[PDB]
Amino acid sequence: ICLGHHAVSNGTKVNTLTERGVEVVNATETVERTNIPRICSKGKRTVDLGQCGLLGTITGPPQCDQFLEFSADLIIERREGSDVCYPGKFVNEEALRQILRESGGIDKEAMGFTYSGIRTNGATSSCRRSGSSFYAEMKWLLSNTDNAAFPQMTKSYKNTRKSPALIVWGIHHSVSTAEQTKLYGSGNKLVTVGSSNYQQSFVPSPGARTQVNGLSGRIDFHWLMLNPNDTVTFSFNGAFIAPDRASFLRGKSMGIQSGVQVDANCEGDCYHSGGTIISNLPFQNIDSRAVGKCPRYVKQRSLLLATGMKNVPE
Amino acid sequence: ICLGHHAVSNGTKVNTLTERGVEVVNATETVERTNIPRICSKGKRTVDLGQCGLLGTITGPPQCDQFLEFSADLIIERREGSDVCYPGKFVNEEALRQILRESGGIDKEAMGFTYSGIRTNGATSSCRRSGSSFYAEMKWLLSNTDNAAFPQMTKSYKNTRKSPALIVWGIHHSVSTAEQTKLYGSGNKLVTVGSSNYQQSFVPSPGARTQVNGLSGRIDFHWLMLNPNDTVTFSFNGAFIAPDRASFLRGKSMGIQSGVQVDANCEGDCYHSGGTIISNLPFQNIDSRAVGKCPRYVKQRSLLLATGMKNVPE
Amino acid sequence: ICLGHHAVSNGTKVNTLTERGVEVVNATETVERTNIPRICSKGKRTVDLGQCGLLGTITGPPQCDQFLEFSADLIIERREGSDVCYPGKFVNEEALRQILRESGGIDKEAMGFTYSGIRTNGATSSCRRSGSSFYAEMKWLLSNTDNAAFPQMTKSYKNTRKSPALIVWGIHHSVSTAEQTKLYGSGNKLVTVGSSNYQQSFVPSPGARTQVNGLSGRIDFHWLMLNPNDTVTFSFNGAFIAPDRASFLRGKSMGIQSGVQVDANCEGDCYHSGGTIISNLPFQNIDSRAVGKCPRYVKQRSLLLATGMKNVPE
Amino acid sequence: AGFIENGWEGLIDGWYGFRHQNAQGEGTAADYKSTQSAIDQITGKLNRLIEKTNQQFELIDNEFNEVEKQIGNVINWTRDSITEVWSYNAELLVAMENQHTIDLADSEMDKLYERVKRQLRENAEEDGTGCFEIFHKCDDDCMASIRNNTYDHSKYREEAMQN
Amino acid sequence: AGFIENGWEGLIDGWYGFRHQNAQGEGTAADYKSTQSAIDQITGKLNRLIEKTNQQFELIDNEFNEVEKQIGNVINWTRDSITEVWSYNAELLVAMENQHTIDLADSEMDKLYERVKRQLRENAEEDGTGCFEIFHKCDDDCMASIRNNTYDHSKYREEAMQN
Amino acid sequence: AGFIENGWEGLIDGWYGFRHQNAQGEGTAADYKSTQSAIDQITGKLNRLIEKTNQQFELIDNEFNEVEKQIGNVINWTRDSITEVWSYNAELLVAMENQHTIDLADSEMDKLYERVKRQLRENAEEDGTGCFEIFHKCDDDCMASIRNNTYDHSKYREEAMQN
Ligand SMILES: *[C@@H]1O[C@H](CO)[C@@H](O)[C@H](O)[C@H]1NC(C)=O
Ligand SMILES: *[C@@H]1O[C@H](CO)[C@@H](O)[C@H](O)[C@H]1NC(C)=O
Ligand SMILES: *[C@@H]1O[C@H](CO)[C@@H](O)[C@H](O)[C@H]1NC(C)=O
Ligand SMILES: *[C@@H]1O[C@H](CO)[C@@H](O)[C@H](O)[C@H]1NC(C)=O
Ligand SMILES: *[C@@H]1O[C@H](CO)[C@@H](O)[C@H](O)[C@H]1NC(C)=O
Ligand SMILES: *[C@@H]1O[C@H](CO)[C@@H](O)[C@H](O)[C@H]1NC(C)=O
Ligand SMILES: *[C@@H]1O[C@H](CO)[C@@H](O)[C@H](O)[C@H]1NC(C)=O
Ligand SMILES: *[C@@H]1O[C@H](CO)[C@@H](O)[C@H](O)[C@H]1NC(C)=O
Ligand SMILES: *[C@@H]1O[C@H](CO)[C@@H](O)[C@H](O)[C@H]1NC(C)=O
Structure with missing residues (x-):
């Protein structure tokens, strides 16, 4: 066998x-x-940002009006997305993107900044809604009459919650020095920030740069994270895009970039x-x-x- | 079987x-x-820094008075450690920490900076010893009468040893522009540094920031490493925390962070x-x-x- | 058996x-x-740079006069190589080096900047050829009479090719403020750059720094990459080292550093x-x-x- | 798969089997224990290699807005190094597992042959090519007794000893 | 550990051994050469795997003062990649070493059995389950002569040949 | 290389071979199939391990102008991690390949011996140390018939059976 x-x-x-x-x-x-x-x-829980940029959900351009308080398990970035309506740029933008991708959504909360002696309804032709508008979560701080001067103002906000808050302010770089004196008055301008871990200086630089959305000036966006029971301070005097509401991370998620x-x-x-x-x-x-x-x-x-x-x- | x-x-x-x-x-x-x-x-050879910060051993706050010239094989950082007594921050702090962890200790040496026509004994209520003191390895450079003006001064120090030296200077950011004019006089101030590999600008920015140790102003600490037979130059005119002694690496060690x-x-x-x-x-x-x-x-x-x-x- | x-x-x-x-x-x-x-x-195809630095091939010091338009498969950097003849430094120098190592060579092209109302033939004793010369690919922009003032000028160049262009400009940091007023006139100077992806500010800082090549002042070199059909803008008014020709990557290569x-x-x-x-x-x-x-x-x-x-x- | 010069393409019943030719016809019936053993071992290999790591990696680069060139070259450098490591590990892993799989099948074949040999003490003798020459005519029911490991090792001894 | 249906839990004297039952009583004595061989091989495996790399790694992060978010995410990304690599290498290493260890022990057992078989040319015959049926009554001293590899291969031949 | 107590240093003709001593003198001639098999297997191992990865890595550091201390420590940290990984992979790779090579040679030796044994059904008997005691005087031409696998398995049977 x-x-x-x-x-x-x-x-x-x-x-x-x-x-x-x-x-x-x-x-x-x-x-x-x-x-x-x-x-x-x-x-x-999927949130397709589309024409809205991931960072814009913190500032609130028109294209992000439907993304100011989203909640997702999977966040999708699109190539047609834009973080700004008025021309500008974020400082440490990719770090904030990587923070917001795994945030699980954002939760806004009013910071409660009251102003006495200035105007607070700036707008532009780029950020368009019904007419000339601006960022939804921001307030373009200007002077009271056309030209005049800006008083040395100081605001502050304390994080009264258990999670770190996301604070974002702006610095307006005018098209020219004469126009900066037209909006905020003559003299040097300083937008001082302050906290237990952060704080800085941030002087504006008015200059006729190029054209992207059709304008020349810019607005640079800066951000920090307030720890619980920590306080932030803003000693400014001109060229200030004040924050109206802060952001809080909802939980955990994942962010991707795709075109399918x-x-x-x-x-x-x-x-x-x-x-x-x-x-x-x-x-x-x-x-x-x-x-x-x-x-x-x-x-x-x-x-x-x-x-x-x-x-x-x- | x-x-x-x-x-x-x-x-x-x-x-x-x-x-x-x-x-x-x-x-x-x-x-x-x-x-x-x-x-x-x-x-x-273990050196438990305790309430003294690793970077402070170069500047010398009160809590680091017993760590100005240490020598160790194992360096331990504690959470209660602080690098500063007067409120401030180090630029490229983590790089300097990673340099000092494997340094094997530090060896100070007098740089020999003599001043003619200014005052050199500034202090503050935060850095406290017997009364109002300051950093042990630094000298707060001020003007001679209350207010007045600061003459355009220029110092220099050559590394006369075989190992690279650690040079650390400071920039005082006053609480207000009027107080900066009170300490150093009116006009623009520039603290120019210089060497074969480094050199820079460093303009101060007076502004009322927040409260940490109880004060408002700040002092930013900057550092470089002088090569052997290389020279450093300081062309300053105000808001200068001059270095009194430089640091030299002893050898090799390891730095850890623990709470046990x-x-x-x-x-x-x-x-x-x-x-x-x-x-x-x-x-x-x-x-x-x-x-x-x-x-x-x-x-x-x-x-x-x-x-x-x-x-x-x- | x-x-x-x-x-x-x-x-x-x-x-x-x-x-x-x-x-x-x-x-x-x-x-x-x-x-x-x-x-x-x-x-x-090997190009031994020798005493010429890799970045210098974009600016064009004397030692790089024979490396302005090279083409190589293997690029070799030497320790005796220098990127500058006039004392200065590149910003993000290592990134540009890593870009130029795999570039396969560079191809210059005239940008076509015409100036009306200023002088454009600055030189120095360091960058020496027949007499006092300057960078081959750059133009030291000055004022017309000794002292006087500099008019607010604005230039622009559009990339009319299929590959991204390399744009490099300079900022002159004078030995003193009086000498800066001697070359470009009194008042604040701002060298604004602009593009679809880049743009910035760049204020000069006149100060007597150290000695390297024998001088005291400096020139900082900055660069960007223009996308196809994208435009760059230079709204300057003093202390400007204008670019004469832009660079284009030839293909692919490898860069090494050796001494054999x-x-x-x-x-x-x-x-x-x-x-x-x-x-x-x-x-x-x-x-x-x-x-x-x-x-x-x-x-x-x-x-x-x-x-x-x-x-x-x- | 050693000295067994070739495989039986007609044996679509299993991996290993018996094919006898005595006097009551032809026989070709697969073995279940060895085949099932090898199938369970290879199945264990596949169930172990097929695995979904619960480790989640986030985005570190950016496809629409390229990050800084220096940190970007560092990220690309690290990702290329890790890619080389995983390519090497995959190559060596697949090669080693294939080697041990082939040698495993050959080992199971040798265990089958050695078991069938030890079942026949002195009733049959070896020839050369993985066969067993019988010296007493073993009918089909006796062949089935050899297959299911029930063939007696002495009740046919002296009949085949003198042959 | 193949066709040997089970192990001897009472054999606390070594790994392998002999257990005979002739006519002068019972016998159970362990073997030293094979057991010592396997013990030396496994001991070599442990002495090779247990190793302290002289490579010292310094701190790259900071637990008390978190570094910048971008470079921190790059560091965390790299450390997680390396962690995945070392987890894979540890898994495959342990699995492979266990496989080769088991197959090594089975191999040493087969070498013991094959040696004891080749020591008995035609004085004893095989049965089926790792035993040797003797056809001449071998006393306890003869069993000891089999254990220490001194049993003669011809001085008991024709006595067991006719049986 | 198991129970074969030592190797033949004089056999410079190949890896394996036969050395007989009958009555017509001495004999020592190498075998070609097993030796060529092992040589082809080891040659395959070398041809597989020797490999030039087409992956090109660019410069990430700078030897003449040191980069920033933080990003430089990150780069050095990553390069040291990768260096540890590749050192481990090289150590384990070489060790495993050497083990499988030695066991491969021993396996080929066992295949040679088992083939020569199965070629001799009952014409010769085993002794103990990898030899075959013949019970009928086999001349040199018969030894050559054993080497080239042409020795008949029955035409010398009953001559050596009665011995
Ligand atoms: C924060 O402050 C509130 C104010 O009373 C206190 O109740 C709470 O315990 C504090 N939490 C922490 C974490 O310090
Ligand atoms: C440094 O300068 C001193 C001054 O004479 C000289 O003796 C020494 O050799 C120099 N060392 C180096 C490394 O240049
Ligand atoms: C660039 O602009 C030219 C101008 O007509 C046009 O022909 C070309 O298609 C454009 N290329 C791209 C890629 O937009
Ligand atoms: C062969 O392997 C594949 C693996 O996907 C399996 O799906 C298939 O059933 C296998 N077929 C046989 C005959 O083993
Ligand atoms: C990294 O590699 C991708 C392709 O895989 C390339 O598109 C990208 O430009 C590279 N990043 C850098 C900084 O060169
Ligand atoms: C079992 O292995 C452990 C490993 O630590 C060893 O300490 C112990 O002595 C071993 N025991 C036996 C019976 O092999
Ligand atoms: C890196 O991971 C640790 C936990 O392992 C976490 O605490 C830390 O925040 C992470 N770093 C960054 C930059 O997210
Ligand atoms: C031994 O191995 C080396 C490997 O380089 C080879 O060159 C040589 O020919 C080999 N010699 C023998 C006798 O196998
Ligand atoms: C990285 O290691 C090299 C030696 O391999 C050393 O010369 C260099 O200084 C190190 N880099 C840093 C940033 O410490």
Whole structure:
């Protein structure tokens, strides 16, 4: 009586420690290549920012009016999103983005800044709503008559909650020094900030820069995080975009950047700009910058794991 | 005659390439979990900074008066430590901390700055000793009468040793512009620094910031490292905290941050905030930020290595 | 009839999973230690910068006059290289270096800045050619008579090509405020830059700093990258080192820093400061900072791979 | 898969099996214990390698607004290093697991053959190519007694000893 | 640990051993060479895996005064990547070493059995479950001669050949 | 390399071989199939381990003009971590490959011996130390017939059976 093993006509070549191209009976794939060209968001609270920028949700341009107090498990950034309506830029913008991606949403709260002796309803043609408007969460602080002067003012706000608050103020860089004297008066202007961990200086710099939204001046946005039972102070005297409401982190979430469609039919925890990687394999060769609970990215496009024996045909 | 192997009633389950939960005869642990809740400092020169901050040892607040010229193999930072007595902040503070942790101690040396035509004994109510004092290694440069003016002064110091020197100066940000004119006189003030590798500008910014130690003004500390046979120059004219002595690194050491007690009975080379990891295992699941000669941190809490054969009972 | 294996008198000890020091028949090395003390540049376009600095090729000091429009596959930086002839420093210098190392060379193009009402032929004793010269790609903008005043000027340049352009301007920090008023006139000076992605402020700071090349003043170099069909704007009024020509990246290359000789006889893709690592082994114990297509650096100096059987002699 | 010169492509019933030719016809029936053992081992390998790490990684770069060039080159440098590490680990992992899988199948085959050999003390003798030459004519029911490990090791002894 | 259906819990004398039952009573005595070999191999594994790397790592973060958020997220990102790498390496390391340890013990057992078999040319025959049926009554001193590898391979031949 | 007490230093002809002493003199001739198999396997190991990764890494530090101390300590920290990872991977890689190489050579030796044994059904008997005691005088041409796997398994049977 004889005894032997089985074989097949068409095997599957794999690689071993000894040889490279051993024909075995059966094999499987370990490096995922298939991609779902959608954002699988089944069972998750998804907020597609769209034309609204992630940082704008703190300042509140028109395009972010519907994102001032959002709550999400999965936050999506779009390429058409913009953080500003009036031309400007954030300082340490990427750090604040990485803070807001895992925030789980934001919760605004009025800071209660009352002003006596100045005007507080500045606007511009860029930030447009019914007419000429401004940031929803900010107040453009100006002087009382056209020209005049700005009194040395000092405000303060104490965080009366258990979570750190997000404080964002602005510095207006005018188109020219004469226009800065037109809005806030002549003389040097200083917008002093203060807290237990932060505080700084922040002098404006009026100068005719370029054109982006169609204007020339700018507004630089700065931010800090107030600890519980800590106080912030603003000793300013001109060129100040005062904050009206502070932000508080809701919980935990994840932020991604993509350009594909949202799909609540499929479920996935690994995302990239091209879609969702739904796989149980330990490796993937799709995108090295994938975020979430992803298989480890490798350079090889295929690595066949042997599931059968050595294939020796007649 | 028969022949076989041994077995036990109660085995030890491990994991293999094939199965998960194979009962073997004997096994050992590879992931360390036991922790000594003390700083094992046997045989090492240990300097517990306590209420003194690591950077303060260069400037010399009261709480660091006993740490101006220390020498250690193991430096310990405490949470109650403070780098300043007068309110202020260091620029690139963490870099200087990482420099001083492995310095092996510091060695001060007088720089020899003589002043003709100004006053040089400023103090404050915060930095308190017998009465109103100041930083031990610094000299608050002021004007000669109350108000008056500050002459454009220029000092210089050459490193006459084989190791790079640590130069630290200060910039006083007054509570108001009128008080800055009271201490240093009216007009613009510029504290120019200079060397072969460094040099800069450093204009002060007087402004009523918040309250920390009880005051409003500030003093920002800046530093550079002079190469051997290199010269530093200070062309200043007001708001200057001049350095009195420079620092030199002694050798090599290690710096840690912890809140547990010092113990000269046990010996260890791996430290964390909770204590000392004394182990010969290749892995540990205690603290991912452990410093020293530590086992590699892993996420698994237990990984049993098989030391016996397959346990097959009757 | 008997049957057995072979052996040798002098074996080779290796390490296994079980023992450490197993004498096997034959073994080979896996950790490369041999080094070629030359820069193997066979078949590559090599540009040895020498006394010219990598950043200088954009500004154009005398020592870089022969490197204004180079093209290379392998760029070599030398320790004697200098980026400046007039004393100064680059802002974000290492980023620009890492950009220029893989640029494959640079291609200059005239920006076409015409000036009406000022002088544009500044020079200095440091940047020397036939007499007192200046940077080749820059124009020191001054006033028309000795002293006088500088008119508020505004220039602009649009990138009319498919690749991003490299724009570099300068800010002159005078030896004193009186000399700055001598070159550009009294009053505040502001050198505003502008683009779709960049734009900034850049106020000069006149102050008598140290001596390096023999002078006291400085010139800080700043840079941006213009996207295709994007425009840059310069609203300046004094202390301006205007750019004459912009730079465009040619393709792809690699930049190294070494102090050994160039050799077009040997070929290598792994370089370090001491020479070229020519090896097929997967590991090397020469330099952990080696660049190119290198074997992975390890700490072990030798790891013997067994190529023979167990050596059991009589 | 050693001296067994080739495999039985017609054995679509399992991995290992018996094929006998005595006097009552032909026989080809697969074995269940060895095949099931190898299948459970490979299945354990797959169930162990297929794994979803609960470690979540957040965004560190930015695709729409590129971060600073220096910190960006540091991030890219680190990500490329980690990518090299995981590519190496994947290569060596797959290669080693394939080697141990092939050697595992060969080992199970050798265990089957050694068991069937030890079941036949002196009733049959070896030939050369994984077969057992019988010296007493073993009918189909006796072959089935060999398959299910019930063939007696003495009740056919002296009949085949003198042959 | 293959066809040996179970282990001897009473054998607290070593890993492997002999248990005979002839006519002068019972016997159970452990073997020293194979047991000592396996013990030295496992001991070598432990002495190699237990290792204190002389590489010292300094502080890169700060627990009392948090560094900048961007560079801090870069540091945390790198540390998490390295943590994943070392967790993978530890998992695969322990699993592989356990596999090779079990297969090593089984291999040493097979070497013991094969040696005792080759020591008995034709004086005894195989049965099925790791035993050796003797055809000449071997007393206790003869069993001891089998244990210490001194049993003659011909001085008891034709006595057990005719049986 | 197990019970074979030592190796033949004079066998400079190959890895494995035969050395016989019958009645027509002495014999020592190497075997080609097993030796060539082991040589091809080790050669495959070397061809797989020797590899030039096409991954190019650029400069991230600066040797002539040191970068900022903080980002420099981050870069040094990451490079040291990666260096530890690759040192570990190299150590474990070399150790594992050496283990599998030695066990591979021993396995090929055991395959050679088992093949030569199975080629001799009952014409020769085992002794103890990897030799085959012949009971019929096999001349040099018969030894050559054993080497090239052409020795008949029955045409010398009953001549050596009665011995
Ligand atoms: C071969 O392996 C694949 C792995 O996905 C599996 O789905 C399939 O059922 C296997 N087939 C056989 C015949 O083993
Ligand atoms: C914050 O201040 C309130 C004011 O009374 C106090 O009740 C609370 O305990 C404080 N919390 C902390 C964490 O200090
Ligand atoms: C089992 O392993 C542990 C490992 O720490 C060892 O201390 C112990 O002596 C071992 N015991 C036996 C019976 O092998
Ligand atoms: C530093 O300067 C002194 C002054 O004479 C000289 O003796 C010494 O050699 C110099 N050292 C170096 C390293 O340049
Ligand atoms: C031993 O290995 C080395 C590896 O470089 C090889 O060059 C040499 O030919 C080998 N010699 C023998 C006898 O195997
Ligand atoms: C750039 O502008 C020119 C001007 O007509 C146009 O032809 C070209 O298509 C533009 N390219 C891009 C990429 O916008
Ligand atoms: C990092 O790599 C990506 C491509 O993977 C590239 O688009 C990006 O520009 C790189 N970052 C930097 C700072 O060069
Ligand atoms: C890094 O992780 C630690 C916890 O392991 C956390 O406390 C810290 O805030 C993190 N750093 C940043 C910058 O988020
Ligand atoms: C990094 O390490 C090198 C030596 O490998 C050292 O010269 C350099 O100073 C280190 N960098 C920093 C920032 O300490």
